[PDB]
Design a binder for this molecule. Structure first.
Ligand SMILES: OC[C@@H]1O[C@@H](O)[C@H](O)[C@H]1O
Ligand SMILES: [Zn+2]
Length: 772
């Protein structure tokens, strides 16, 4: 009673938003130049590139990482479509990386600048690990993971035997690199973000049937993250989120591949840790669109204030990764709970995240991937372009839209699970069945399953009845059936299905009003599983299509004060009831209640809302508390927005991407978190380059009041000797040091360096903000 999935070859998408997203991504993938993506690999192998690498992250230290994702996305797109242009690119990319691999002859393939020197040092036990760095390199373990993954996917999806041997050679190479390292050394190294290496090493174990790769997969499992999760402890506050999710996927994969390993007793524990991780992130750390994190990090689960105020809402990779995890947990959920039927609550999550975040994260006509999806009312999101943008979210973006076929159905001997209501044709070879699902969902409630071919075996269709949603029709005849539960469940329908049979059901959709999880005054409207949003305007959408600059993934355009965005006046039940469905064949709604300030509001599915500012979460105010809530918006929030709109450059020390984007250098430095803000400090020094788009007159530095450590500040190597203005401390003990610069910083770049000022350390610096 094992549940399994269908391959992408056996699930054809029919006309729908999902097929459109697939075709749009197909065009994006084919626009990339494989000579530019291969260039880093060929360079590190001592060969001559046929073209320059791409810029952005591909020439500032993550060189090679898109090439890995590119392999994965081509392979999956190929399995999904058979597209001949796709195969030309895959065959070329693989053969170029093969030449690279053969030129060095040890198994190594890699794009990180100075790769061979790096892995030489590591092998010798010269391990200098930070959060996002290893021996001066930018997350090289994460980088090389995308190659492992890509080669795995070329083998699994496109049947490449060449990819299979390249993968085995590359894995054997890592066994050699790590053979002289102790567990303490491995665990030290793993403090640097390493993607899901443990997952891929477990995949190689399964492909080869050789346990040495399972041993390797466990050695690459980061213990400081795993052990609390085994014990149902969420210690994720302050952690970089997309760093962790692949680790957890890997723990789960190691458990799967270890199911019948007589020499290791830990499979159930590792599975459980993955299951807890999922439960805790979904139930306490996720917003209505299915994603998590603010500025790439987990914020406290009892404080979503940053999620509603910061322009850097959920990162798309994180959701991509949660969906991968969801798929693994669902599959043996019936084994784990003893029912032998999989748990549809996983599918409720998959559906929410697929329609509302994944589908929303690609510009649907031209293409372009989203990195950050703000939940702040009245902001907008930025899209990648093929030749300019080399972000992680481009990489996972390429994969996302290749594989919408993967979770629509699942099969279990003589049972088919119908999980997603996505127009599709299924080839259920195992039971000689071909089936077509037709529906306009979510713009209509009706779903039809048609049997195109069958071999008259008795089969049970398990139709998902989501919590948000019994009369079915079979060949014109109604079969009424009684609700066993209000929870998410399956309706079984068993027949000797034959060609021409037709099953029709309806999914009743209702308006709901979902509060932000910490129960502050913010709510989002849904219709069935679809998050609605309103378009608040189309001005100041700066960089909506990104250039190749560092920080180009961020929507840096003017911030609108929250008091200029519609706030909903009244109590939640009245607000819910004031939303009314407009007629037409596409979902649209008008909000007929009191809105401050008045704009009536039209709401549409967030996944169709593009090239504009929006609100998903609306601020809400009771009639009684209106005066005090509006006054806070009109004074404190208004001033915070003034501050943002005066900011020329902004760095969050201790946060990897802001640091990387400003060319972090350091000696004898550490990072951490305190009162939910990140810091960096050093006994030596740490520096960044400020990007000065407009002339700046002030430098604002945030430190803790009670920190006795002091920093000297150098600006292009000149000591800043001006006396700062010192703010009053906030609730958490933080103060701002405002330096009025003797001369205005001129447009361009300028180094800022922090050194200890007599004390053992610099001050712990929690923010660097340059102001007009
Ligand atoms: O560090 C590599 C990737 O880029 C990051 O900033 C993402 O959040 C992370 O997983
Ligand atoms: Zn990303």
């Amino acid at each position: 009673h094992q549940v399994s999935y269908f391959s992408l070859q056996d699930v054809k998408l029919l006309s729908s938003p999902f097929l459109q997203a697939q075709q749009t991504d197909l065009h994006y993938i084919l626009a990339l130049d494989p000579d530019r993506l291969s260039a880093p690999f060929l360079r590190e192998a001592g060969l001559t590139p046929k073209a320059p690498s791409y810029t952005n992250w591909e020439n500032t230290g993550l060189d090679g990482h898109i090439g890995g994702h590119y392999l994965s996305a081509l392979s999956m797109m190929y399995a999904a479509t058979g597209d001949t242009a796709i195969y030309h690119r895959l065959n070329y990319m693989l053969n170029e990386l093969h030449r690279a691999q053969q030129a060095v002859g040890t198994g190594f393939i890699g794009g990180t600048p100075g790769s061979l020197q790096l892995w030489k040092e590591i092998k010798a036990g010269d391990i200098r690990a930070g959060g996002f760095s290893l021996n001066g390199k930018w997350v090289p373990l994460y980088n090389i993971h995308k190659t492992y993954a890509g080669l795995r996917d070329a083998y699994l999806y496109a049947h490449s035997d060449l990819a299979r041997q390249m993968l085995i050679d590359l894995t054997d190479w890592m066994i050699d690199i790590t053979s002289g390292l102790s567990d303490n050394q491995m665990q030290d190294m793993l403090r640097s973000e390493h993607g899901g290496l443990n997952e891929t090493f477990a995949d190689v174990a399964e492909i080869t049937g050789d346990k040495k790769y399972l041993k390797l997969a466990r050695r690459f499992s980061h213990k400081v993250i795993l052990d609390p999760l085994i014990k149902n402890e969420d210690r994720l506050n302050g952690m970089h989120a997309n760093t962790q999710i692949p680790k957890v996927i890997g723990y789960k994969r190691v458990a799967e591949v270890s199911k019948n390993d007589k020499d290791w007793n830990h499979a159930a524990e590792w599975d459980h840790a993955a299951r807890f991780f999922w439960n805790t992130v979904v139930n306490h750390r996720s917003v209505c669109i299915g994603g998590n994190s603010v500025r790439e990090h987990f914020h406290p689960s009892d404080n979503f204030t940053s999620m509603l105020n910061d322009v850097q809402g959920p990162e798309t990779c994180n959701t991509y990764n949660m969906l991968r995890l969801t798929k693994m947990l669902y599959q043996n959920s019936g084994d784990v709970d003893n029912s032998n039927k999989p748990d549809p609550r996983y599918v409720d999550y998959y559906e929410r995240a697929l329609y509302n975040h994944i589908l929303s994260s690609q510009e649907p006509d031209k293409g372009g991937f989203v990195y950050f999806t703000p939940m702040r009312p009245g902001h907008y999101r930025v899209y990648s372009q093929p030749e300019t943008s080399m972000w992680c979210c481009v990489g996972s973006g390429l994969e996302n839209h290749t594989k919408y076929g993967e979770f629509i159905y699942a099969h279990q001997q003589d049972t088919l699970y119908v999980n997603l209501f996505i127009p599709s044709q299924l080839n259920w070879k195992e039971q000689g069945v071909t089936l077509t699902q037709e529906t306009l969902f979510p713009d209509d409630e009706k779903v039809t399953l048609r049997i195109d071919k069958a071999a008259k075996k008795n089969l049970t269709l398990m139709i998902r009845i989501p919590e948000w949603a019994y009369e079915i029709t079979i060949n014109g005849k109604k079969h009424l059936s009684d609700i066993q539960t209000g929870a998410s469940t399956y309706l079984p329908i068993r027949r000797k299905w034959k060609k021409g049979d037709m099953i029709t059901f309806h999914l009743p959709m209702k308006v709901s009003l979902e509060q932000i999880p910490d129960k502050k005054d913010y709510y989002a409207f849904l219709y069935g599983p679809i998050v609605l949003a309103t378009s608040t305007g189309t001005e100041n959408l700066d960089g909506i299509y990104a250039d190749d600059s560092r920080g180009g993934h961020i929507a840096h355009g003017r911030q609108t004060p929250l008091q200029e965005i519609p706030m909903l006046i009244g109590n939640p039940d009245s607000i819910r009831h004031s939303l009314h469905k407009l007629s037409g064949s596409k979902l649209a709604f008008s909000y007929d209640g009191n809105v401050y300030p008045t704009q009536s509001l039209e709401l549409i599915p967030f996944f169709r809302l593009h090239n504009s500012r929006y609100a998903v979460y609306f601020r809400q105010a009771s009639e009684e508390q209106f005066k005090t809530i509006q006054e806070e918006m009109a004074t404190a929030e208004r001033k915070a927005t003034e501050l943002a709109n005066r900011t020329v450059d902004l760095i969050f020390p201790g946060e990897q991407q802001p640091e990387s984007d400003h060319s972090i250098q350091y000696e004898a430095s550490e990072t951490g978190t305190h009162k939910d803000r990140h810091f960096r400090r050093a006994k030596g020094w740490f520096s960044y380059n400020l990007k000065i788009k407009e002339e700046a007159s002030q430098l604002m530095i945030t430190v803790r009041q009670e920190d006795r450590n002091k920093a000297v500040i150098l600006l292009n190597n000149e000591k800043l000797t001006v006396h700062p203005t010192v703010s009053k401390a906030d609730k958490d003990g933080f103060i701002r040091l405002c330096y009025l610069l003797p001369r205005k910083l001129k447009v361009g770049s300028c180094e800022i360096l922090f050194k200890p000022d007599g004390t053992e350390w610099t001050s712990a610096v929690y923010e660097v903000r340059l102001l007009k």
